[PDB]
Scaffold this active site. Sequence first.
Site, PDB file in Angstrom:
ATOM      1  N   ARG A 177      29.415 144.397  46.911  1.00 37.79           N
ATOM      2  CA  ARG A 177      30.551 143.709  47.516  1.00 37.79           C
ATOM      3  C   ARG A 177      31.390 143.055  46.419  1.00 37.79           C
ATOM      4  NH1 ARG A 177      26.213 143.113  49.937  1.00 37.79           N
ATOM      5  NH2 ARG A 177      25.695 141.072  49.041  1.00 37.79           N
ATOM      6  N   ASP A 242      19.466 143.272  47.511  1.00 34.42           N
ATOM      7  CA  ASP A 242      20.628 143.295  48.393  1.00 34.42           C
ATOM      8  C   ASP A 242      20.611 144.224  49.597  1.00 34.42           C
ATOM      9  OD1 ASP A 242      24.090 144.044  48.337  1.00 34.42           O
ATOM     10  OD2 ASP A 242      23.245 142.073  48.808  1.00 34.42           O
ATOM     11  N   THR A 243      19.464 144.387  50.240  1.00 32.94           N
ATOM     12  CA  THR A 243      19.407 145.247  51.416  1.00 32.94           C
ATOM     13  C   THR A 243      18.791 144.506  52.599  1.00 32.94           C
ATOM     14  OG1 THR A 243      17.316 146.229  50.618  1.00 32.94           O
ATOM     15  CG2 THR A 243      19.347 147.422  50.142  1.00 32.94           C
ATOM     16  N   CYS A 348      15.889 156.835  52.003  1.00 35.53           N
ATOM     17  CA  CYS A 348      15.351 155.593  51.430  1.00 35.53           C
ATOM     18  C   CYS A 348      13.855 155.551  51.152  1.00 35.53           C
ATOM     19  CB  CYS A 348      15.698 154.382  52.304  1.00 35.53           C
ATOM     20  SG  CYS A 348      15.111 152.806  51.590  1.00 35.53           S
ATOM     21  N   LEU A 349      13.512 155.250  49.900  1.00 37.10           N
ATOM     22  CA  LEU A 349      12.123 155.155  49.452  1.00 37.10           C
ATOM     23  C   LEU A 349      11.486 153.838  49.878  1.00 37.10           C
ATOM     24  CD1 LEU A 349      12.778 156.519  45.899  1.00 37.10           C
ATOM     25  CD2 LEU A 349      10.858 157.351  47.255  1.00 37.10           C
ATOM     26  N   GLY A 350      12.307 152.811  50.059  1.00 32.77           N
ATOM     27  CA  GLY A 350      11.772 151.521  50.445  1.00 32.77           C
ATOM     28  C   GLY A 350      11.837 151.213  51.927  1.00 32.77           C
TER      29      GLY A 350
HETATM   30  C1  HEM Z   1      17.131 147.665  55.615  1.00 36.86           C
HETATM   31  C2  HEM Z   1      16.999 147.947  54.263  1.00 36.86           C
HETATM   32  C3  HEM Z   1      17.401 149.097  53.594  1.00 36.86           C
HETATM   33  C4  HEM Z   1      18.378 149.996  53.939  1.00 36.86           C
HETATM   34  C5  HEM Z   1      19.314 149.945  55.154  1.00 36.86           C
HETATM   35  C6  HEM Z   1      18.366 151.042  52.919  1.00 36.86           C
HETATM   36  C7  HEM Z   1      19.231 152.127  52.935  1.00 36.86           C
HETATM   37  C8  HEM Z   1      19.204 153.126  51.993  1.00 36.86           C
HETATM   38  C9  HEM Z   1      20.068 154.277  52.066  1.00 36.86           C
HETATM   39  C10 HEM Z   1      21.086 154.571  53.160  1.00 36.86           C
HETATM   40  C11 HEM Z   1      19.734 155.072  51.025  1.00 36.86           C
HETATM   41  C12 HEM Z   1      20.326 156.448  50.721  1.00 36.86           C
HETATM   42  C13 HEM Z   1      21.520 156.316  49.794  1.00 36.86           C
HETATM   43  C14 HEM Z   1      22.136 157.661  49.431  1.00 36.86           C
HETATM   44  O1  HEM Z   1      21.686 158.696  49.965  1.00 36.86           O
HETATM   45  O2  HEM Z   1      23.073 157.682  48.605  1.00 36.86           O
HETATM   46  C15 HEM Z   1      18.656 154.389  50.307  1.00 36.86           C
HETATM   47  C16 HEM Z   1      18.059 154.854  49.137  1.00 36.86           C
HETATM   48  C17 HEM Z   1      17.064 154.175  48.446  1.00 36.86           C
HETATM   49  N1  HEM Z   1      16.526 152.957  48.813  1.00 36.86           N
HETATM   50 FE1  HEM Z   1      16.808 151.974  50.488  1.00 36.86          FE
HETATM   51  N2  HEM Z   1      17.380 150.806  51.956  1.00 36.86           N
HETATM   52  C18 HEM Z   1      16.816 149.593  52.348  1.00 36.86           C
HETATM   53  C19 HEM Z   1      15.834 148.927  51.627  1.00 36.86           C
HETATM   54  C20 HEM Z   1      15.308 149.356  50.409  1.00 36.86           C
HETATM   55  C21 HEM Z   1      14.313 148.612  49.639  1.00 36.86           C
HETATM   56  C22 HEM Z   1      13.657 147.299  50.047  1.00 36.86           C
HETATM   57  C23 HEM Z   1      14.078 149.315  48.500  1.00 36.86           C
HETATM   58  C24 HEM Z   1      13.093 149.060  47.535  1.00 36.86           C
HETATM   59  C25 HEM Z   1      13.278 148.157  46.487  1.00 36.86           C
HETATM   60  C26 HEM Z   1      14.971 150.467  48.567  1.00 36.86           C
HETATM   61  C27 HEM Z   1      14.992 151.455  47.601  1.00 36.86           C
HETATM   62  C28 HEM Z   1      15.692 152.622  47.739  1.00 36.86           C
HETATM   63  C29 HEM Z   1      15.659 153.654  46.748  1.00 36.86           C
HETATM   64  C30 HEM Z   1      14.807 153.682  45.484  1.00 36.86           C
HETATM   65  C31 HEM Z   1      16.522 154.609  47.177  1.00 36.86           C
HETATM   66  C32 HEM Z   1      16.911 155.864  46.419  1.00 36.86           C
HETATM   67  C33 HEM Z   1      16.136 157.085  46.849  1.00 36.86           C
HETATM   68  C34 HEM Z   1      16.719 158.359  46.272  1.00 36.86           C
HETATM   69  O3  HEM Z   1      17.858 158.312  45.746  1.00 36.86           O
HETATM   70  O4  HEM Z   1      16.036 159.404  46.346  1.00 36.86           O
HETATM   71  N3  HEM Z   1      15.674 150.515  49.766  1.00 36.86           N
HETATM   72  N4  HEM Z   1      18.314 153.206  50.926  1.00 36.86           N
END
Ligand code: HEM
EC number: 1.14.15.1
Length: 405
Positions: A177, A242-243, A348-350
């Site tokens: 943001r 920030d998620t 999403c991995l997390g």
């Molecule tokens: C409600 C919480 C969360 C939402 C809505 C969310 C949403 C997303 C989305 C939409 C993507 C795909 C982005 C893309 O395709 O360009 C993503 C990727 C990812 N998220 Fe989450 N996320 C959340 C929490 C987390 C947390 C807590 C972590 C861990 C620290 C995390 C780590 C990642 C990682 C490592 C990826 C990349 C995976 C890849 O590129 O193969 N996320 N997330």
Amino acid sequence: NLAPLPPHVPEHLVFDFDMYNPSNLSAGVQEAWAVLQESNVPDLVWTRCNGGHWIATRGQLIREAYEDYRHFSSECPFIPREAGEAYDFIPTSMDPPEQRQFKALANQVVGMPVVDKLENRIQELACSLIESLRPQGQCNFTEDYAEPFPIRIFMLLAGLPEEDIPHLKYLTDQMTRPDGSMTFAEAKEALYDYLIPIIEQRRQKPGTDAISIVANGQVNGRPITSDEAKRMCGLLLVGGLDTVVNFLSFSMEFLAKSPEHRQELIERPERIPAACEELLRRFSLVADGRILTSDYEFHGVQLKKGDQILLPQMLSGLDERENACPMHVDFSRQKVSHTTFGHGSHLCLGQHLARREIIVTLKEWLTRIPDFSIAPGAQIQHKSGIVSGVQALPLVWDPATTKAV
Ligand code: HEM
């Protein structure tokens, strides 16, 4: 600030939507974005704001584009182009088959087994945080719980000092943001300056933290490089800080306004998991994109190589064609359809860690503070970007109605 219309963009496909400052923001960020789904808006449009880019407005297209990495590459996932070009996080900035290798290692530091291992700790922090607020009768949810809870858990996983939170949180926020205070490249630079020393030390004297695990991992049979570790860790940092932070506020803002929904979860706790999914659908908050690797005709529209396209993960579940009465929160929905955690090889991995933190928060909060509302006179303001958020959330409640557990 609108950019001149490119030669290949039909004038009727134009809709000047600003993802950083949508028009009806006052009504809520999700509502503000949903205007792209009105009858008068084509499925695929072009906005001249933020440099000019396409926007897919339907779940069907969003999913398709995310499944087709051959034409829509992750190489440049952020808008404006300057940000997307400076974007080098691993594994999101890479396309398969390459992506797979790194995805595997990241899954090792935030995958299911890790969550299972941290469960008791997540439950402990939630309980402690809430119990400490319960008798006060009021709080600013965003800074009193939404931020400390998920962030401290992450710092614990990463083995980083709780004193760096203010610094780290600020840099992260400028990436999703933008305040105008600093460009993406600068925010990214600053964050890397912070990680390099740490990764260095973690390579020589390894620990059991996520950073040590990553800094000393093996990719494609060989060992990960400093640069690679730095770029992957930077990504886990942004995800951890920030998620979940922002999502919890949206949900709590809604629960504070809906006594019937709070009650339902208090009486039929078996519904919480389902409720979690419905809230993830209704208060989806992420929107990034892809870049066209070549000229390609997508659903009758001609896309030119180099064109950037926003594929709002947040819109899929708000699309009436996928979910009837999209703006209505219904915990008993037969089928909850969304792409809140993404779609395709970059899912999403997390998400397991996320769901765990959400479900724990819901269960532990309503147990001790079943009745609460938004403070009088307070006007809740949302903010738009790659990841949307809430400025502040003043809550109030009668301690006499709380329950010490
Ligand atoms: C409600 C919480 C969360 C939402 C809505 C969310 C949403 C997303 C989305 C939409 C993507 C795909 C982005 C893309 O395709 O360009 C993503 C990727 C990812 N998220 Fe989450 N996320 C959340 C929490 C987390 C947390 C807590 C972590 C861990 C620290 C995390 C780590 C990642 C990682 C490592 C990826 C990349 C995976 C890849 O590129 O193969 N996320 N997330």
